From a paper:
Human Miro1 and Miro2 (hMiro1, hMiro2, also called RhoT1 and RhoT2) are MOM protein homologs that play a critical role in mitochondrial trafficking38394041424344. Both associate with Parkin upon mitochondrial depolarization and are ubiquitinated on multiple lysines18374546. We also find that despite considerable similarities between these two substrates, Parkin modifies hMiro1 much more robustly than hMiro2.
To better understand the difference in ubiquitination efficiency between hMiro1 and hMiro2, we first determined the crystal structures of the isolated cGTPase domains of both proteins to high resolution (hMiro1-C: 2.25 Å; hMiro2-C: 1.69 Å). The overall folds of the hMiro1 and hMiro2 cGTPase domains are quite similar (rmsd 0.78 Å over 129 Cα atoms). The dimer interface is a highly conserved hydrophobic surface along one face of the cGTPase domain, which, in the intact hMiro1-BC structure, forms the interface with the second hidden EF hand (hEF2). The cGTPase does not mediate dimerization in the context of the full-length molecule, as the hEF2/cGTPase interface is mutually exclusive with cGTPase dimerization, and hMiro1-BC is purely monomeric even at high concentrations. Interestingly, although the same conserved residues mediate dimerization in hMiro1-C and hMiro2-C, their dimer relationships differ significantly. Subsequently, we successfully disrupted dimerization of hMiro1-C in solution by introducing three mutations at the hydrophobic interface (V418R, Y470S, L472A), thereby generating a stable hMiro1 cGTPase monomer (hMiro1-CM). We note that the two lysines in addition to K572 identified as ubiquitinated by mass spectrometry of the hMiro1-CD, K454 and K512, can be mapped in the dimer, but not the monomer, to roughly the same continuous surface containing K572.
Residue numbers in the entry: 415 to 580
The structure:
Amino acid sequence: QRNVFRCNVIGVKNCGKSGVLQALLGRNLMRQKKIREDHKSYYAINTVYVYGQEKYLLLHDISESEFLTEAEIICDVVCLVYDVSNPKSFEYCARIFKQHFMDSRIPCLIVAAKSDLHEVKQEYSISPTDFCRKHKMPPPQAFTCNTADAPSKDIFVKLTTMAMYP
Ligand SMILES: Nc1nc2c(ncn2[C@@H]2O[C@H](COP(=O)(O)OP(=O)(O)O)[C@@H](O)[C@H]2O)c(=O)[nH]1
């Protein structure tokens, strides 16, 4: 029936959440810097085709906080973003997941953002891939909006599909 799926994008400050939203709007990192708006938008929506069917993904950029409200938790799919160049970024995703999403039926996708940069060891007891396995998530999906042309919309197809068939 419904073809608009809500996705909460979660991660530490400057882990690249805003970049993910802008990428859904077809803007790479270069154009994101050229753009100047009166106010930054923490929501973004765009068309996402799944199996030839027109769907829409509504992204909600959740700014970093030690605590999330039920308003920031309810969604069709959660996108946990960490920065491959920030060794402290994944711990936040893992903590938020266990605290708010582990005991729910909301599908979760982990995104390794800024994949264009050089990977560093994450300061967490578990590796990102092991964490996904333990909690029955897909593998961490590499992502970058730092491209010559429009960023790849692969993660958005994935997020939308996961939301469709929870
Ligand atoms: N190299 C690189 N830098 C990025 C990427 N995405 C964001 N950044 C930079 O990382 C910083 C934080 O990004 P932003 O999207 O504002 O993070 P947010 O605070 O989580 O929304 C900015 O200086 C961005 O230009 C990416 O894919 N690659």
